[PDB]
Design a protein around this ligand. Structure first.
Ligand SMILES: *C(=C)C1=C(C)[C@@H](Cc2[nH]c(/C=C3N=C(/C=C4\NC(=O)[C@H](C)[C@H]4[C@@H](*)C)C(C)=C\3CCC(=O)O)c(CCC(=O)O)c2C)NC1=O
Ligand SMILES: *C(=C)C1=C(C)[C@@H](Cc2[nH]c(/C=C3N=C(/C=C4\NC(=O)[C@H](C)[C@H]4[C@@H](*)C)C(C)=C\3CCC(=O)O)c(CCC(=O)O)c2C)NC1=O
Ligand SMILES: *C(=C)C1=C(C)[C@@H](Cc2[nH]c(/C=C3N=C(/C=C4\NC(=O)[C@H](C)[C@H]4[C@@H](*)C)C(C)=C\3CCC(=O)O)c(CCC(=O)O)c2C)NC1=O
Ligand SMILES: *C(=C)C1=C(C)[C@@H](Cc2[nH]c(/C=C3N=C(/C=C4\NC(=O)[C@H](C)[C@H]4[C@@H](*)C)C(C)=C\3CCC(=O)O)c(CCC(=O)O)c2C)NC1=O
Ligand SMILES: *[C@@H](C)[C@H]1/C(=C/C2=NC(=C\c3[nH]c(C[C@H]4NC(=O)C(C=C)=C4C)c(C)c3CCC(=O)O)/C(CCC(=O)O)=C2C)NC(=O)[C@@H]1C
Ligand SMILES: *[C@@H](C)[C@H]1/C(=C/C2=NC(=C\c3[nH]c(C[C@H]4NC(=O)C(C=C)=C4C)c(C)c3CCC(=O)O)/C(CCC(=O)O)=C2C)NC(=O)[C@@H]1C
Ligand SMILES: *[C@@H](C)[C@H]1/C(=C/C2=NC(=C\c3[nH]c(C[C@H]4NC(=O)C(C=C)=C4C)c(C)c3CCC(=O)O)/C(CCC(=O)O)=C2C)NC(=O)[C@@H]1C
Ligand SMILES: *[C@H](C)[C@H]1/C(=C/C2=NC(=C\c3[nH]c(C[C@H]4NC(=O)C(C=C)=C4C)c(C)c3CCC(=O)O)/C(CCC(=O)O)=C2C)NC(=O)[C@@H]1C
Ligand SMILES: *[C@H](C)[C@H]1/C(=C/C2=NC(=C\c3[nH]c(C[C@H]4NC(=O)C(C=C)=C4C)c(C)c3CCC(=O)O)/C(CCC(=O)O)=C2C)NC(=O)[C@@H]1C
Ligand SMILES: *[C@H](C)[C@H]1/C(=C/C2=NC(=C\c3[nH]c(C[C@H]4NC(=O)C(C=C)=C4C)c(C)c3CCC(=O)O)/C(CCC(=O)O)=C2C)NC(=O)[C@@H]1C
Ligand SMILES: *[C@H](C)[C@H]1/C(=C/C2=NC(=C\c3[nH]c(C[C@H]4NC(=O)C(C=C)=C4C)c(C)c3CCC(=O)O)/C(CCC(=O)O)=C2C)NC(=O)[C@@H]1C
Ligand SMILES: *[C@H](C)[C@H]1/C(=C/C2=NC(=C\c3[nH]c(C[C@H]4NC(=O)C(C=C)=C4C)c(C)c3CCC(=O)O)/C(CCC(=O)O)=C2C)NC(=O)[C@@H]1C
Ligand SMILES: *[C@H](C)[C@H]1/C(=C/C2=NC(=C\c3[nH]c(C[C@H]4NC(=O)C(C=C)=C4C)c(C)c3CCC(=O)O)/C(CCC(=O)O)=C2C)NC(=O)[C@@H]1C
Ligand SMILES: *[C@H](C)[C@H]1/C(=C/C2=NC(=C\c3[nH]c(C[C@H]4NC(=O)C(C=C)=C4C)c(C)c3CCC(=O)O)/C(CCC(=O)O)=C2C)NC(=O)[C@@H]1C
Lengths: 164, 184, 164, 184, 164, 184, 164, 184
């Protein structure tokens, strides 16, 4: 699972090296940056249902056709699963903020996603709109410090780009 | 591999929950600089450690360097010195990550079986690992003796606290112990 | 050449990845740590001749036999070259402090060194001794800050270990 | 590959001299946080940039999507989008390192040849690259226009300064110019 | 283990061949040359202690600094192990004389040797000097026939070269 | 692999002793020309041997060449022919070396398991090796019968002695026995 | 081209080795054995036409059907090339005696021979019969020394085996 | 690769005729023991020859160990020592074989263009080879000076004749000259 430290460790192992100067430096960056992304991680943990709800709302508002007969938001099951999905991505982003690398989102969110949505005729635009709404939504210092919002937003764009 | 953080992430995902216990992690952070020192302390002294330990293993059991001994002839001695270095290397990886998975996965997995096939003595390997465990503890605490080191003594010069990083010493030791538990 | 940023870029490229979270964080480490190693690097640059002179002096003092006829410190040419060699290592170390990775020392100092000394019959112990003297020599705050000294000593130990 | 600092060391090694002037380097450190925002701004909007740039190349030259056009059929179009993203990705590496060597060595080397062999048109590629050049500047300065972005407009929210990272804009633009140069 | 016959068998096996003309011929060479190397082999077998003792003596006389505190010939244990080491090399030469190939020397002496001496900080010049002494010591017909001595010397140079 | 001499060396090294008794070694040398003739005798008639031995295995067991038989159809017959030759080849290597290790390490190691997975009938294999063994012995003594050979009879024209290389016949036979032994 | 010396050289080169003890011993084998094989090569050089002629004669007298219309010895051209072929093998054998390895016969005669003879519908039994006659024909010391004849016969049997 | 004998065979096969002249091959055999001494003389002193030749190449051209020099830094010095040894090794192969083809095919072919692409200096390469040519001649004649060897002097102890193997010395030199011709 990719983080600052697993990345320098994997590269060191590939060359049969002990951790050296640049490996310790790298991890000090993870030390430096942890406050910002853990603040984001804690804020997101405390408020994930609300954040996910309003992103979900926004994507259905953008695309009301999803509510039409036989479309992907048309039943109670489907509505519940769509919100769950939005939540999944946000929880995986909470994980990535904790880890300090895209690892959790890479492995449990992005990998396989396009296959899954293809197989089930799930349009990807509503996913992108849910995440884009959440990306444009936060502001500092109301929601979190500016550097914490930077981390939050960076992982949202990373998720967005993975679908784009 | 996992680190201390993705480990907590994995444990949380097992109930599909967010990570809320952010105290141990904050703690991990607050002692981040000490961890880096601890790693620096081992890596910087890795060669002195490895050779002292394998030599220590031999001086306690001359069987290893006699006819039929597993450190005889030269290439076996070289092979053993090599292995000692490999184990120390992965332990230091485990310490830097603050998680044992890289050590379990890339080093220990299938090690006992390998040594069994080769006839590499378990008792002796474990001893060498025990000596490095004692070495690592001393260097992390920055209290190596001149008695064991001589002219090759090294001082790290890290900011001293009273417990001389007792927590990290425990962690580091728990990784060498995973080695020992694996080989026996 | 191995540095913080070249290591994460190479890992990124290998997986076809844009720079992401953990990559930027790593470089923030390089940022936080530069003052230390650049302080050491600056001090080393200004005093490299005196620093290498006394390391060289210390290794010859450990091994006076080097002075006997036919030995590696026995002539004016050999003497100048032995001092030069110590200074080469110290300069590669200054380079490696500037870079914040072992790159310059790996590629221009360590690579091939054992072949060269073996081929010319140059005993390695005087090299290790010069560097060990240098490693034990510094004290903070006298010589530089404690973190600068830490950086300085790690590169010395790194080079020592390459000959050990 | 080299970065900003090991480039300085390569220059010093040409005369076997120590690195004495760290003024340009201290500055690189001083603008460190800017560099990261600049990289973040490009990587974060990479997908929008690539599709917008390739689409722009095509709307200004319809021959690319007509019979015998190099963005016809679907797999040529896909190949092109891929190449535009590859190019941007290596530019982002160079901006992250403060040095063009990763770009020159892993991307541009033999690129003109490859395109020549495949009949990929130089002129159209240059224009795609030119558009990406324009985009990255605006994103580095954090002044993208709603006219070009519509609903996809992104603001990065970095601390604003008067020149809006003009020297980083120039550097990023020099990397794009290298690309164009390798094709000319 | 490399000898005349294992070399040709290995070559034949790699091309899926029965032994043929050139293989029998090679082995005829072993037969013809055996008298000389077996002569040296027997001479060495009967007198290896004395041969190794004086070679060992010559390297310490050459490098008395080895007797200094902390050095490789300084203690009784260290002293026994150095003489032992000189006898190891000579016994592997004895083996190589019997086999008619560098096999025994290659696998049980040279392989790994540089790594061992580097890790233990053992200087290689004294090994080279003991072997050079031995190499320069013999003369024919006094010690054995001229052809026996040529075999004996060639394997000493082989061991010396492997350390240079 | 080892040969007769390095086998002796391996045995001396087990007690880190010089090789003192060169009696068997001196005798090996004295009978060196004989050994070369005995290897020439087998290598020179290998094809006639292989074919005669496989055909004799078959004529004594017609089941091998009926439906369900392991020498049916053509490609199985071909594969068997090849195995007989491969076996003979490694026996000649051993005979030339004066040691079975090359036979052991490169041919017999895991042969049993390989045959068991494919369903190669051990009983029949044994017969083919037996015939080669009888053939080899007769060619080493340079006394093949016209009865078994017909128009394909060969004489080596080596210098005859009383026992007709009895010791080398027993050695050669022991390698064939090892083949058969490796099968269980 | 496989000889005693190229075989040991190729093995040394694969291991990056200077010539060593077992390589020189091997070439001594060539010195020792060359008298016998050069004697055979010289006899063959002087009498190859007569030796080929009778071997050719014997194979046709063995298989008269080859003289039937459409068969491989039925025309003057066919007759001339069949004799020529037998002389080819004998010449390559003469080359292999000179070289002391099967090289010349391997590369210039055996490689491809089955494909050729298959393509042109040339039966191999007459080839084998000509060589078998030649192999049974010689006797020592009438034609050459016993060891020269051993060398001669070994290469004939080598050829025979390659067609069998 | 070819040897002195297969060289004759190739020449003969170019007119599909038997090798008829052997007297010159007989003379090769006659000096066979000599040739083995000549080879032993170079091989046994190879390390001393390479280090001494590369050192002389350097002491005559200091540019090589100064900034920008092709024996600077360490890895370049190590490469050069490696190349001198590789060249010496193929030269001894050629002398063992009595034919240049192994030197031509495995070492010299493409080498000039390899060096031009690297900027390995012709003048210094030639000089290194020149010194090894002078060394080789003296060791084959078994007359090396104390002046050039100091305490490293080695004497081979081979049976002395008046001309001290003049044709082998000339032949050895011709192979070194082949190297010099190839590279300049
Ligand atoms: C055989 C005669 C023999 C030995 C060899 C030796 C082995 C040994 N070493 C230790 C303990 C340590 N070794 C250390 C190594 C070093 N210290 C340094 O400062 C340099 C960098 C490095 C190389 C010499 C260290 C730090 C220790 C910790 C203890 C201390 O500092 O005093 C042991 C003890 C292991 C244990 O606890 O069981 C042994 C056995 N001893 C021999 O008898
Ligand atoms: C075809 C009819 C056609 C186009 C398609 C379009 C192509 C084009 N785009 C630009 C300039 C920019 N595009 C930008 C892209 C984005 N901005 C965002 O906020 C999102 C993340 C992203 C995707 C929409 C940006 C930032 C720019 C910079 C200029 C600006 O911000 O206004 C150009 C101009 C290129 C140049 O300046 O030379 C072109 C041609 N135009 C078409 O005609
Ligand atoms: C099936 C009908 C059947 C057979 C086929 C045949 C198989 C067989 N062969 C032998 C013994 C030998 N065969 C030899 C082969 C050769 N001798 C030559 O001169 C040429 C070059 C070569 C090929 C023909 C040799 C040398 C022997 C040894 C005996 C002897 O020389 O007289 C056996 C006997 C094996 C044994 O004793 O166990 C068998 C079964 N026999 C068949 O029944
Ligand atoms: C730089 C100051 C410098 C040198 C280094 C040195 C290089 C050099 N060496 C020779 C000639 C020989 N060197 C030989 C080597 C050896 N002799 C031995 O006994 C041992 C085994 C081995 C290593 C020391 C030999 C045999 C010779 C031949 C001459 C001789 O008298 O023996 C030369 C001369 C080469 C030439 O003629 O072109 C040089 C330049 N000389 C330096 O100036
Ligand atoms: C040009 C690129 C921009 C711009 C950039 C500025 N950023 C400034 C400060 C700053 N940026 C960050 C985020 C960055 N640092 C990191 O460690 C990581 C990821 C791990 C990132 C993305 C930080 C932490 C800081 C410092 C704190 C702060 O200043 O708030 C900055 C001010 C410093 C300077 O002048 O160099 C600038 C100018 N600003 C612009 O005007 C354009 C749009
Ligand atoms: C059992 C194998 C045989 C048998 C063998 C004998 N061979 C004897 C001598 C001999 N053989 C060779 C040929 C061999 N040496 C080689 O170098 C090569 C190829 C490179 C081969 C094939 C030679 C050269 C000699 C020596 C001839 C000479 O005297 O110059 C031999 C007599 C010596 C002894 O008693 O050992 C024997 C007995 N003889 C038999 O009875 C069976 C059939
Ligand atoms: C020029 C190279 C030398 C020189 C050489 C001579 N060597 C002569 C004889 C000789 N050398 C060997 C050893 C050689 N044969 C082997 O089988 C092996 C290794 C397996 C080696 C190294 C032998 C066995 C012999 C023959 C016995 C003897 O002569 O003592 C020799 C005399 C014969 C001849 O004239 O060709 C010479 C001249 N002599 C010189 O002057 C320079 C220094
Ligand atoms: C800065 C002044 C902005 C702006 C911000 C507003 N946000 C408002 C409500 C709101 N925002 C969020 C998302 C936020 N909560 C989180 O936990 C996280 C990340 C973990 C984020 C980004 C939520 C869930 C809510 C509803 C609950 C709440 O009030 O916080 C808000 C109130 C009015 C509204 O709902 O829109 C404001 C003003 N608005 C602006 O105009 C600038 C651009
Ligand atoms: C040293 C304290 C021991 C000892 C060690 C020996 N190990 C030998 C071979 C060997 N070791 C390993 C494990 C090593 N390789 C890895 O890749 C990793 C982790 C990633 C480890 C720990 C392997 C796979 C092998 C076999 C291949 C090889 O040779 O490297 C060895 C040689 C055995 C032999 O061939 O005789 C020795 C002597 N031996 C000792 O006596 C002490 C207790
Ligand atoms: C701390 C109180 C130590 C201690 C320090 C002393 N160092 C002395 C002289 C000295 N040290 C260095 C190395 C230093 N200069 C550099 O440029 C760099 C790295 C770039 C380092 C580490 C030098 C070159 C010199 C001589 C010139 C000078 O004094 O500045 C010193 C003076 C006495 C002496 O030379 O030994 C002291 C006391 N000494 C200690 O006992 C504690 C452990
Ligand atoms: C030739 C006349 C030389 C020369 C030779 C001397 N050697 C002397 C003593 C000596 N040499 C050895 C080594 C020798 N013995 C072996 O068993 C083997 C190899 C298996 C070798 C090479 C030993 C062990 C000894 C001491 C016992 C003994 O005397 O045999 C010697 C006596 C005086 C002395 O010890 O130096 C001589 C004269 N000396 C020369 O000046 C020419 C060049
Ligand atoms: C002939 C006397 C037997 C017999 C033999 C068959 N063997 C078949 C396959 C086979 N055999 C081997 C072992 C062989 N290959 C080696 O590399 C070596 C030693 C280096 C040896 C001894 C292998 C590995 C294989 C499988 C690959 C292959 O097909 O060649 C075989 C074909 C079985 C099948 O595919 O059905 C046969 C028939 N069969 C007999 O009936 C007699 C007893
Ligand atoms: C030994 C007494 C044999 C035997 C031999 C006979 N050979 C006869 C003629 C003959 N042989 C050859 C082949 C021979 N010449 C060569 O140049 C070479 C190799 C280079 C060989 C093997 C030829 C070409 C000829 C015809 C010319 C000639 O006479 O030399 C021969 C004369 C009667 C006959 O031709 O059959 C005899 C007696 N005959 C035997 O019965 C024993 C076993
Ligand atoms: C020493 C006398 C020279 C010198 C030599 C250097 N050679 C360098 C690289 C190099 N050399 C070769 C040829 C070598 N490899 C082979 O496989 C064979 C024959 C089988 C030979 C002769 C190659 C192919 C290469 C490049 C690849 C590699 O290094 O393995 C070299 C390093 C060049 C660089 O990286 O800049 C040096 C310094 N240099 C000198 O100054 C003297 C004249």
């Amino acid at each position: 699972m990719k983080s600052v430290v697993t990345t320098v460790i994997a590269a060191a192992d590939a060359a049969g090296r002990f951790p050296s100067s640049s490996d310790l430096e790298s991890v000090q960056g993870s030390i430096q940056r942890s406050a910002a992304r853990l603040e984001a991680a804690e804020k997101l943990a405390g408020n994930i249902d609300a954040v996910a709800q309003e992103a979900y709302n926004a994507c259905i508002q953008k695309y009301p056709y999803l509510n039409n007969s036989g479309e992907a938001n048309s039943t109670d099951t489907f509505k519940a699963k769509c919100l769950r999905d939005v939540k999944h991505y946000m929880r995986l982003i909470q994980y990535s903020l904790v880890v300090g690398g895209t690892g959790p989102l890479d492995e449990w969110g992005i990998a396989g996603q396009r296959e899954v949505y293809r197989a089930l005729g799930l349009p990807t635009a509503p996913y992108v709109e849910a995440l884009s709404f959440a990306r444009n939504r936060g502001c500092a210092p109301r929601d979190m410090s500016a550097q914490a919002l930077t981390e939050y937003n960076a992982l949202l764009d990373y998720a967005i780009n993975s679908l784009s | 591999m996992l680190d201390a953080f993705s480990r907590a992430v994995v444990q949380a995902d097992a109930s599909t929950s967010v990570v809320a216990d952010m105290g141990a992690l904050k703690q991990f952070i607050a002692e981040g600089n000490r961890r880096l020192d601890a790693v620096n302390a081992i890596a910087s002294n890795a060669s002195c450690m490895v050779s002292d330990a394998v030599a220590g293993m031999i001086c306690e059991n001359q069987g290893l360097i006699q006819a039929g001994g597993n450190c005889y002839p030269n290439r076996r001695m070289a092979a053993c010195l090599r292995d000692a270095e490999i184990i120390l290397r992965y332990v230091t990886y485990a310490l830097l990550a603050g998680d044992a998975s890289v050590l379990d996965d890339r080093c220990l997995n299938g090690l006992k079986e390998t040594y069994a096939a080769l006839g590499v003595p378990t008792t002796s390997t474990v001893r060498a690992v025990q000596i490095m465990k004692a070495q690592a503890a001393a260097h992390i605490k920055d209290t190596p003796s001149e008695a064991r080191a001589g002219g090759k003594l090294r001082k790290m010069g890290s900011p001293v606290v009273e417990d001389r990083c007792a927590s990290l010493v425990a962690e580091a030791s728990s990784y060498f112990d995973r080695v020992i538990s694996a080989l026996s």
